[PDB]
């Protein structure tokens, strides 16, 4: 008896300094991006079509702090000087549920990936169908 399956998502972050932007209290301003992909059962990256939207919830001092994206890989691009942490809401197809995933934005590496396992229900036929792309159900 099984009502859910687990899938691993991979959050991919890059960042680099923008030298044309004045540092803020000696901290350089960086352009940074986050994208999300789904891993299949062999660990290959595929589009994360199990989400029909992703909202990045940024530090409230950002101009546009809750940014909604609807297409894989849900790429957000922003600029800042401090590595303020953020929360990533991913919404499963067919109103199957929000999963709210914190993320640390850090400037020690040029790019880094972080994986998360999420548990997904098997009770919305379209999602259940979509889940077949990334592993067994």
């Amino acid at each position: 008896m099984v009502a859910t399956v687990k899938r691993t998502i991979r959050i991919k972050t890059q960042q680099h300094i923008l030298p044309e932007v004045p540092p803020v209290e000696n901290f350089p301003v960086r352009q940074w991006s986050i994208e999300i992909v789904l891993l299949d059962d062999e660990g290959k990256e595929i589009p994360a079509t199990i989400f029909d939207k992703v909202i990045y919830h940024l530090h409230p001092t950002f101009a546009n702090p809750n940014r909604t994206f609807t297409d894989p890989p849900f790429r957000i691009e922003e600029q800042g000087w401090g590595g303020f942490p953020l929360d990533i809401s991913v919404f499963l197809l067919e109103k199957a549920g929000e999963r709210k995933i914190p993320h640390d934005l850090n400037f020690l590496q040029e790019s880094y990936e972080v994986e998360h396992v999420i548990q997904i229900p098997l009770n919305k036929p379209l999602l259940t169908e979509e889940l077949a792309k990334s592993g067994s159900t």
Side-chain angles (χ1 to χ4, degrees):
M1 253 152 112
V2 37
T4 62
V5 299
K6 291 193 190 161
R7 291 287 188 265
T8 304
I9 62 172
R10 177 180 294 155
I11 314 181
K12 299 156 67 145
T13 302
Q14 302 181 250
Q15 60 83 16
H16 66 281
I17 291 171
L18 295 172
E20 75 270 19
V21 179
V24 182
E25 312 184 344
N26 303 143
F27 297 97
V29 170
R30 298 164 183 278
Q31 171 124 321
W32 55 262
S33 64
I34 310 167
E35 304 191 327
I36 306 184
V37 302
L38 176 61
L39 305 187
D40 74 7
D41 54 6
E42 302 179 294
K44 154 247 255 324
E45 300 182 353
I46 62 170
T49 61
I50 53 164
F51 303 138
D52 63 2
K53 70 182 201 236
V54 170
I55 309 174
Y56 297 91
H57 303 286
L58 305 185
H59 195 285
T61 63
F62 274 84
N64 297 282
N66 301 294
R67 310 266 278 112
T68 290
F69 291 87
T70 54
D71 309 295
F74 308 101
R75 180 182 170 100
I76 181 169
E77 288 187 11
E78 254 299 347
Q79 290 176 17
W81 50 276
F84 302 119
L86 55 129
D87 276 312
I88 300 175
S89 283
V90 297
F91 286 85
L92 294 163
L93 307 182
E94 292 297 76
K95 291 179 178 165
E98 181 184 5
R99 304 282 181 274
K100 240 279 229 41
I101 293 167
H103 188 57
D104 186 62
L105 178 63
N106 92 87
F107 298 154
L108 277 188
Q109 300 170 244
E110 182 179 345
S111 65
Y112 59 95
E113 306 73 51
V114 183
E115 292 163 20
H116 293 275
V117 179
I118 60 167
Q119 271 205 40
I120 298 159
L122 285 174
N123 58 352
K124 303 292 186 179
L126 280 194
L127 177 47
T128 293
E129 289 192 342
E130 205 60 25
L131 282 163
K133 297 179 175 167
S134 50
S136 58
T137 48

